Amino acid sequence: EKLEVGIYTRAREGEIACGDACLVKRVEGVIFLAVGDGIGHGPEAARAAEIAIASMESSMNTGLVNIFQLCHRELRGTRGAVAALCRVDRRQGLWQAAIVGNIHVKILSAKGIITPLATPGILGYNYPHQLLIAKGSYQEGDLFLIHSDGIQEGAVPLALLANYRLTAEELVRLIGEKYGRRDDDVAVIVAR
Ligand SMILES: [Mn+2]
Ligand SMILES: [Mn+2]
Ligand SMILES: [Mn+2]
Numbered sequence: 001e002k003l004e005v006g007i008y009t010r011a012r013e014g015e016i017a018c019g020d021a022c023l024v025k026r027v028e029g030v031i032f033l034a035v036g037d038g039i040g041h042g043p044e045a046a047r048a049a050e051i052a053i054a055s056m057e058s059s060m061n062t063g064l065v066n067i068f069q070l071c072h073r074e075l076r077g078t079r080g081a082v083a084a085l086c087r088v089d090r091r092q093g094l095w096q097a098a099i100v101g102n103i104h105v106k107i108l109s110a111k112g113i114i115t116p117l118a119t120p121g122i123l124g125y126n127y128p129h130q131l132l133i134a135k136g137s138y139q140e141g142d143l144f145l146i147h148s149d150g151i152q153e154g155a156v157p158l159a160l161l162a163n164y165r166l167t168a169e170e171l172v173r174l175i176g177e178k179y180g181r182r183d184d185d186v187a188v189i190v191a192r
Contacts, residue, residue: 006168019045075124150186
């Protein structure tokens with residue numbers, strides 16, 4: 001059955017462009033989910049977050065190491081950005097995820113609630129010694145939450161993600177509105 005995915009973003013109060021960006025891309029039973037947060041706020045941050053997302057999309061199915069290394073190259077000379085990507089291979093029942101910087105990922109799975117470890121750094125400026133790719137098993141019903149630091153780590157009550165009285169689209173909007181800081185850009189993806 002289809003993976004339901006909701007996206008929500010909101011600019012920092014007073015800005016007219018959101019400095020965070022989201023990507024959901026479906027490719028032959030493999031789904032990619034990404035959030036980027038351009039350093040700072042406003043249109044220069046937005047430019048960087050969108051460059052990061054566009055770069056990822058162009059690099060899909062070359063492997064996360066390559067994906068993040070090209071992101072870093074395309075972001076040289078810009079604001080820079082931090083970013084997370086989850087690659088969910090539903091057909092083979094596997095996921096991989098990695099994070100450069102402070103995007104937050106949580107994966108609620110039949111195997112347990114798993115929070116992938118971020119590697120410090122800023123794409124475009126300081127690439128980590130090496131990317132730490134978390135790996136796990138996926139089965140239908142597992143939930144993925146990704147958000148920028150517009151929402152504090154651990155702010156979202158987990159059980160809300162298993163509430164199917166709201167759609168994923170409705171749920172990420174509620175999450176962004178309840179938990180999103182108004183002094184920063186906010187971006188959230190939920191997939192289930
Ligand atoms: Mn930012
Ligand atoms: Mn489902
Ligand atoms: Mn931020």
